[PDB]
Each structure stands twice: as structure tokens, then as C-alpha cells.
């Protein structure tokens, strides 16, 4: 029940300032320092520094001095990362990680916060169902899907039946054809299950706040 | 600063075999004061935050399956997986935890060799919610194949088209170790409605003849 919950994804323009929170629960907050780890897309882990939860004093790595700031709010058991003067090299996923009680490892990790830096504006997506033209004959399995087009920025969360339908799901990585992203997802269920029982595609675009459930009836 | 070098960069095994990966450090990470090696091993699965596997170079984290074994001392360290399962697909990182800055290695990526598998191919005409909006996207899913190399062609009235097609591959699956890819052909309203037969054809290593799916206008 130790948990680190980070704030949601952020879209900024070059030169601006972003603040990511990391709220800690389940342990005594002032006995474990907080590390920050950066991960650019498709790349490895880079340790940025840590903040002592008892003293408040931060220590930063050499690449991260000057534009980066660690902060604490002990009343809320929260750690903060501030990035000033954003460049395109700051587009990454940032993790908060708790120092272990050994002083030798990072015990628990937050889910990560994706910071996207681009001059483009936030556009909501259009969600379309993907139904097979011909009904199932003797294949015993039916494949269905949904297409999310024209969204910016990443990410979007796509689930099926609010997470209950999780085996047989393929969510494909988004491709940026223009200044808008397009993603598609597929589910494969038995021919007995569909269309007798409902299957719904749930899409979340938190930058535009566009939660949408769509049924795939016809 | 201390440099952590990881080797091999990437390696591919069949499920059930043993793997070993090396982590070497620029300075020694052994302190005789506690008689411990300050090196940590983390595992990162696709899309997830890094999960702690081994601290103090040999101690497993609580709840870890017993196939994972850490080993080594001083500057030379090894992580061993006794019998790999399909869920062990990941990137494995080591971290210097001796001295500031607490640097990571560049990682070792673990991929899986599976038997060859043909794609399950599904073709989908555009939704009416998109068709009345003036756009059209015909989608083709090629699900659960191995290996990753695959080719898709689109046929409009028998003549092959490659313009306006977007492709996307998933990562290797954590449960059946296959790959999947989606191909999306995006046209306008009247361009889609002025032709009848649409064909998605797929060539893979498994069959000399391609797997063909098609539809017509009802």
C-alpha cells in the first residue's frame, strides 16, 4: 500500500515552465528521500538528482543544474519537479522514485509524467468504431476495433469494457502523419460472446480531457 | 563520474533458457564497512515504470520470483534468469549506488524467440460517423505473428496503392511473444464512395502465398 502518484501529462511550448507533482502515501514521508529520473522516448534512464525529505536540501546532477528545481510540501507528503525554459530535449517521461530504507536502491516508483514540448495546440480526437463487414461463419473468433484520429498531444489511454476485457487486446503505437496523431486498437473475442454481450472502447485524452465510451454495435 | 557499462546491449532467447547479463563499473562499489556491494538491478517492461529487482547485488526484492539471481562483486556484476518466461520481456538496468551521481547503465534489452506464426488479418470499412464527416479511413489489423518482418499491400479495383497509408507495429507481447501491426489508408468521402472493392493483402515468412482480405459496397 506504499504508493507514489504523479500528476498527469503536460503539453508546453518551448521556453515555458512546468511543475510535476508526486504525492506519496503509505509510509512516513520524512524518512525517505525522493529521486527524479528522466526518460526521453526510446532511450534509457538518466538520474537527475534527489531531494532530502527531512532537510529539504536538493542535490542535482551536472546536466540538470540551472533549469531544474526540486521542491517539497511535507504537509501534503508531496515532491515537486519544476522545469524552467523548456527545450525540445525536455520532451520525456519523468519518474519520481523513493530512496529505499537500505540507502542503496530505489524501492517504489511513480507511474511517470510525460512532458511534451511543441508549439502545436491541443486538439481533441475523433473516435470511430471498426466493425467487420461479414458476420462470423465458422472461424469461432471475431476481431473488432476502434480508431482514434487527429489528436494532439500524446498520450491517450484505450481500454475495452473499462478494463474487464484485457486479454486479446492490441493497442498500436500512434503515428504522427501531420501535426495530429492517429492510433488504433483491436480486440479479439469469441463469436459466442459478441454480439450477445456488449464491448465498448474507452478512450481518454487527458490533455483535452476527452473521455469517450463508444459501443461497436453494427 | 562513475560509468556503468552494460553488456550485451540486446539478446534474444527462447522461453525456458538461461540468460546472463553483465554490468561493469568505472569505480568499485564494494564497501567493507557493511560488507555490501552498492549496485542495483531494475527491470522495465514496455510502458511501465522501472521495477526494482535486486539491491546489494544479490538480495532479491520481496515477492520476486526465484528465477532472478543477482551476482558479482566490486566492479563486475551479473544478473541471471534461470528459465525465462514470456513475461520476462524487458530492459534490465543497473545503477551505481555507491557515490554521487548515482548513474545508470545503458541497459540490456531481453527479447524472445518464438515459433513462426501467420497474422490474423482483419479489414474494416470506415464508420458512418467518419463518412458523414467527409473523411474515410479503411483499417487493416495483422495480429499475433512472429517474426516481426511483414509486408502489406492495398488494392483498389486490383490496382495497388501506397499513398496515404500509415503503418504501426506493436512491441513484442508479454504473454504470447508475437507482434502485431495496423495499416490505415485514409481517403476523402467521394474518393472512397466512387470505388467498390477494397483489398488488404499480407505477405509473411510463414506462407509463400499472401493472406488476402477484402470487402465490397453493400
Amino acid at each position: 500500500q506504499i504508493q507514489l502518484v504523479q500528476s498527469g501529462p503536460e503539453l508546453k511550448k518551448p521556453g515555458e515552465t512546468v511543475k510535476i507533482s508526486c504525492k506519496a502515501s503509505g509510509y512516513t514521508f520524512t524518512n525517505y528521500g525522493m529521486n527524479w529520473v528522466k526518460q526521453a522516448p526510446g532511450k534509457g534512464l538518466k538520474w537527475m538528482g534527489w531531494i532530502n525529505s527531512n532537510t529539504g536540501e536538493p542535490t542535482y546532477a551536472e546536466e540538470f543544474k540551472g533549469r531544474f528545481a526540486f521542491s517539497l510540501e511535507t504537509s501534503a507528503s508531496t515532491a515537486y519537479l519544476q522545469i524552467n525554459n523548456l527545450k525540445n530535449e525536455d520532451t520525456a517521461t519523468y519518474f519520481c522514485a523513493r530512496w529505499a530504507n537500505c540507502g542503496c536502491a530505489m524501492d517504489y516508483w511513480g507511474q511517470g509524467t510525460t512532458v511534451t514540448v511543441s508549439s502545436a495546440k491541443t486538439t481533441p480526437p475523433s473516435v470511430y468504431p471498426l466493425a467487420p463487414g461479414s458476420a462470423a461463419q465458422t472461424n469461432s473468433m471475431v476481431t473488432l476495433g476502434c480508431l482514434v484520429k487527429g489528436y494532439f498531444p500524446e498520450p491517450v489511454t484505450v481500454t475495452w469494457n473499462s478494463g474487464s476485457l484485457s486479454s486479446g487486446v492490441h493497442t498500436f503505437p500512434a503515428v504522427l502523419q501531420s501535426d495530429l496523431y492517429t492510433l488504433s486498437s483491436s480486440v479479439t473475442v469469441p463469436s459466442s460472446t459478441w454480439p450477445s454481450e456488449t464491448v465498448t472502447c474507452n478512450v481518454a485524452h487527458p490533455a483535452s480531457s476527452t473521455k469517450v465510451d463508444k459501443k461497436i454495435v453494427p | 563520474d562513475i560509468v556503468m557499462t552494460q553488456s550485451p546491449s540486446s539478446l534474444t532467447v527462447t522461453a525456458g533458457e538461461k540468460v546472463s547479463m553483465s554490468c561493469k563499473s568505472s569505480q568499485s562499489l564494494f564497501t567493507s564497512g557493511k560488507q555490501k556491494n552498492y549496485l542495483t538491478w531494475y527491470q522495465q517492461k514496455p510502458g511501465q515504470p522501472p521495477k526494482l529487482l535486486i539491491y546489494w547485488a544479490s538480495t532479491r526484492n520481496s515477492g520476486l520470483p526465484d528465477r532472478f539471481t543477482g551476482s558479482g562483486s566490486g566492479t563486475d556484476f551479473t544478473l541471471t534468469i534461470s528459465s525465462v518466461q514470456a513475461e520476462d520481456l524487458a530492459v534490465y538496468y543497473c545503477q551505481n549506488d555507491y557515490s554521487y551521481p548515482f548513474t545508470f547503465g545503458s541497459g540490456t534489452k531481453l527479447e524472445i524467440k518464438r515459433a513462426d506464426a501467420a497474422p490474423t488479418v482483419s479489414i474494416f470499412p470506415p464508420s458512418s460517423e467518419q463518412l458523414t464527416s467527409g473523411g474515410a479511413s479503411v483499417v487493416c489489423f495483422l495480429n499475433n505473428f512472429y517474426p516481426k518482418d511483414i509486408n502489406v499491400k492495398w488494392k483498389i479495383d486490383g490496382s495497388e496503392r501506397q499513398n496515404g497509408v500509415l503503418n504501426s507495429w506493436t512491441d513484442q507481447d508479454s504473454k504470447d511473444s508475437t507482434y502485431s501491426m495496423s495499416s490505415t489508408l485514409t481517403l476523402t468521402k467521394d474518393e472512397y464512395e466512387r470505388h467498390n472493392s477494397y483489398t488488404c493483402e499480407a505477405t509473411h515468412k510463414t506462407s509463400t502465398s499472401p493472406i488476402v482480405k477484402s470487402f465490397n459496397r453493400n
Binding site: 520524512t30 524518512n31 525517505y32 528521500g33 534527489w50 532530502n52 525529505s53 527531512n54 532537510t55 530512496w99 529505499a100 530504507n101 540507502g103 542503496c104 | 562499489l29 564497501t31 564497512g33 552498492y38 549506488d97 555507491y98 557515490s99 554521487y100 548515482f102
Partner: peptide, 9 residues
Amino acid sequence: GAGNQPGAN
């Protein structure tokens, strides 16, 4: 136990 004193020191 700390936690806030990491590393070999």
C-alpha cells in the same frame, strides 16, 4: 534507517 543518507558515504 535512512533513506535520507544514501550511498556508501
